[PDB]
Amino acid sequence: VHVVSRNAEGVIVVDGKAYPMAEELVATESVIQRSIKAVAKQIADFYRPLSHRDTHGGGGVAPISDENPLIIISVLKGSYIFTADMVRYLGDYGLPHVVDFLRVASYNKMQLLAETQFKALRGKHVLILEDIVDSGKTLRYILDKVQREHQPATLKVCVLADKPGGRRVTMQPDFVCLTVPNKYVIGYGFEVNDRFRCFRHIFTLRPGEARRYPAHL
Amino acid sequence: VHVVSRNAEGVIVVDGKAYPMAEELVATESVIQRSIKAVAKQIADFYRPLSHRDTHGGGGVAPISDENPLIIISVLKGSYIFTADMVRYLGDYGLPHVVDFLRVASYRGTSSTNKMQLLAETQFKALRGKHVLILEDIVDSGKTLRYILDKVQREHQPATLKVCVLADKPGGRRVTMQPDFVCLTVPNKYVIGYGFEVNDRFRCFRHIFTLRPGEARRYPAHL
Ligand SMILES: Nc1nc2c([C@@H]3N[C@H](COP(=O)(O)O)[C@@H](O)[C@H]3O)c[nH]c2c(=O)[nH]1
Ligand SMILES: Nc1nc2c([C@@H]3N[C@H](COP(=O)(O)O)[C@@H](O)[C@H]3O)c[nH]c2c(=O)[nH]1
């Protein structure tokens, strides 16, 4: 169980630990984990009965199985902790799956930083695991690229977080674990220059803290 | 308390779930997590007293801090689950750290041994004079880690370079390689579960098992 309060300095404390960079708590670890496990059950219920291209028996179509698993593409770096937890819940619900990774970045225009290494996704069910949908530009770019380069049977998106008010392009993920306020979030994979990703809870960031670490790593 | 049993087919069952690909149980989730958390305390206790190059203020040397954190390089794809768990324990013990990834792959070839390639480079570019810790899944022959250490040292010139492995298979060594931190020791068998794979299968298991002999060729098709 968690205790969420503010100390005498007005700083958020969760389970005895102070978070002076946080404006508000969004979700505790318990709430996050319950939300991910609930979505894992939805993903397993949706994909378990489906069939797709048989690459194990070089055959036609066959059920999702350890021979022909659901293909999961995890988006680095923000989704790796979420992915590690989600795959264990998907295993709990008995969904056969395998995970590869891609990474994208913006210069705002989008560019691939790291490509997936899976090469046989034609006619396969593919699920993207991503940390958050905000404007929707990052996921529109990933979906268009995976669709044209891999030609999957179906392509869906599961996000840990949906920031509804940030949308600038049409993008509604098929699966959403949590809804967050229209603010910059940190914790549980969410970072400020790679800091704060290890927090077990999600918080909104005090606006003055966003440029605290300007030096490139 | 986990319930470990065998069904009428002789298959290992842990908490009601059957593992027909497994020969024996090595470690339950409870044992694995306790072992990782213990090593996280050792890592935090070792690094929090240290200092390294100040890139935040452009001074000389400064203590490990959120301004100048420990640099962790995680080896993809094998270490991502271990890394996700370890970083949360390191945060519990108050160790300032950041994580970047290197991706290495092994391919079946025409030569005597499977061949290694670097698929993804680190994105971090200011590791000179920094304390760097590598997080890796297992040390068996030691060849993979010797390759990674040499590369990281030559390209980044770190102040110090150490290795933490989830698993040590001591009886598989072919080259000198002793990790600085070891969470658990595994039998001289092919292990699966908790990140350990057969062609990307079995990584999601909460427990570590030994693989039934010959089952490493169960999924021959390239993904
Ligand atoms: N830490 C933190 N990252 C993001 C992002 C990052 N930008 C991308 C998503 O943005 P978008 O949908 O606008 O294209 C992702 O790479 C995500 O990691 C959006 N919003 C936040 C937020 O509130 N907090
Ligand atoms: N699933 C599973 N992988 C490996 C490996 C693989 N080879 C790498 C390390 O090998 P080595 O030390 O022999 O160079 C590991 O990162 C992993 O990919 C060795 N032993 C095992 C094992 O018992 N089980």
**Chain A contact for B69 (CB, 8 A cutoff):** yes
Q: Which ligand approaches the C-alpha of residue A104 most closely?
A: 1
What is the pairing mode between strands A110-114 and A97-106?
Answer: antiparallel
| The two three-digit tokens of residue B155, written as one number | 């390209």
Q: Who contacts B157 (Cβ-Cβ below 8 Å, separation ≥6)?
A: B127, B128, B129
A91/A122 Cα distance (integer angstroms): 24
Interior/surface letters B171-183, b for 16+ CB within 10 angstroms, e for the rest:
eeeeeebebebbb
Task: Tell me if B87 and A198 make a contact (CB, 8 A cut-off).
Answer: yes
What is the pairing mode between strands A202-205 and A185-186?
Answer: antiparallel
Length of chain A measured in residues: 217
B190/B137 Cα distance (integer angstroms): 13
B97/B91 Cα distance (integer angstroms): 8
Of A55, A90, A216, the CB nearest to B221: A55
Of A55, A91, A119, the CB nearest to B204: A91
**Chain B contact for A80 (CB, 8 A cutoff):** yes
Strands (E), chain A: 4-6, 12-14, 17-19, 22-27, 51-53, 61-63, 70-76, 97-106, 110-114, 125-133, 154-162, 175-179, 185-186, 202-205
| Bridge partner list, B132 | B71, B161
Q: Is the peptide bond before B162 cis (omega within 30 degrees of 0)?
A: no
Q: Who contacts A100 (Cβ-Cβ below 8 Å, separation ≥6)?
A: A71, A72, A73, A74, A116, A117, A118, B77, B200, B223
B121/B99 Cα distance (integer angstroms): 13
DSSP secondary structure code for residue A90 in this structure: H
Task: Tell me if B204 and A119 make a contact (CB, 8 A cut-off).
Answer: no
B74/B77 Cα distance (integer angstroms): 9
Q: Who contacts B219 (Cβ-Cβ below 8 Å, separation ≥6)?
A: A56, A66, A67, B198, B199, B201
B136 within 8 A of B189, measured Cβ to Cβ: no
Of chain A, the end-to-end C-alpha distance in Å amounts to 36
Q: Is B148 in the pocket of ligand 2 (CB under 6 A)?
A: no
A215/B61 Cα distance (integer angstroms): 15
Phi then psi dihedrals of residue B98, to 5 deg: -135, 155
Q: How many CB atoms lie within 10 A of CB B54?
A: 17
Q: Can you give the resolution of this entry in Å?
A: 1.3
Nearest CA owner, ligand 1 atom 8: A138
DSSP secondary structure code for residue B124 in this structure: -
* Helix ranges (DSSP H) in chain B: 29-47, 80-92, 143-156
Sequential DSSP letters for B143-186 = HHHHHHHHHHHHHH--SEEEEEEEEE-GGG-SS----SEEEEE-
Q: How far is CA A177 from the centre of its chain?
A: 9
Nearest CA owner, ligand 1 atom 6: A132
Residue B66 designated active-site: no
Q: What method was applied to determine this entry?
A: X-ray
For residue A56, the chain B residues in CB contact (below 8 A) are 219, 221
Name residue, tokens 């989730």.
B29
A83/B140 Cα distance (integer angstroms): 26
For residue B90, the chain A residues in CB contact (below 8 A) are 198
B11 within 8 A of B18, measured Cβ to Cβ: yes
**Chain B contact for A97 (CB, 8 A cutoff):** yes
B201, B80, B19: which is closest to A71 by C-alpha? B201
Of B80, B119, B126, the CB nearest to A217: B126
A74, A115, A201: which is closest to B92 by C-alpha? A201
